[PDB]
Symmetry: C3
Subunit: 123 residues, 3 copies
């Protein structure tokens, strides 16, 4: 395997929350139902959501951000141990296959009113 792409993204939490409040349908456009919930069942907060948005932008970047990709075809899930993970389906999986991506790595940080993600695509 070799590195096929890297992405980084930094989002302002306040701006992102304002985007969500302005267009009620937006959250469901960007996120699967599972992503909108905490492991317990509570609704996920805006900073954690901004970090997942940053993950999806970073993932897009690592794939060369082509047209035709759906936000709901990338999913951030969470291991029992707490590690965030990427699962790709449909349009995003198809693009990753064009490029030969076998493995995804993500990390998130959110603090200081800002959410950051890095994504590495390997294959």
């Amino acid at each position: 395997m070799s590195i096929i792409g890297v992405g980084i993204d930094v989002a302002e939490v306040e701006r992102f929350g304002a985007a969500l409040e302005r267009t009620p349908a937006l959250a469901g456009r960007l996120f699967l139902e599972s992503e909108l919930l905490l492991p317990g069942g509570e609704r996920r907060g805006v900073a954690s959501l901004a970090a997942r948005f940053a993950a999806k932008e970073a993932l897009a970047k690592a794939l060369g951000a082509p047209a035709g990709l759906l936000w709901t075809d990338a999913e951030v899930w969470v291991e029992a141990g707490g590690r965030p993970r990427l699962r790709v389906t449909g349009t995003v999986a198809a693009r990753a296959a064009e490029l030969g991506v076998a493995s995804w790595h993500v990390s998130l940080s959110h603090d200081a009113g800002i959410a950051s993600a890095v994504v590495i695509a390997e294959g």
Copy 2:
């Protein structure tokens, strides 16, 4: 070798310095004596320290942040050329062995009142 994990962490310098001043024992809990000094012998400043804290969080993230890890079992050292490096011992080395990590890569930045680190674990 393949990538086994990635971590990113962004820390607010002011907040971190306030944490250090509030609990005198904290610095010695987070850092080895060597990390608290500049190559000359002067005491390392708060921004540079916040960046090493971010490195250790990022390293934890790349390992899936399990319980039982000691801050003093990760060490940021510095090459003659100035490159920051990671050395892992004890509990952190043990966890990296569980995952098959052979090689560590780190970079630091601190500026704008914020410290950032990225860590990649390969093996």
Copy 3:
């Protein structure tokens, strides 16, 4: 191939623009003519330029930031699809050869008055 280095850099856009305005010769010292233009032909703006500066710092970091490297020996170019790319020549290529670097990966983000880059060197 394995990872040979990683770099991250975060630059304040305002500070960087002030540096450019203060010393007219600075832009031409840091950037090739091609980097100072948008694909159309318009002059590239300060935030996008700060992000390319961050890329070159990040690239320097991934190489262990030795003496003797020229800013104009690293070039950020842009694919038809929009992906940013690194090309290295002269002094920067020579240093990458010392270390065995075969492949470069970069991503950029600029938002919230700040520009960020990550660079990975593989070989």
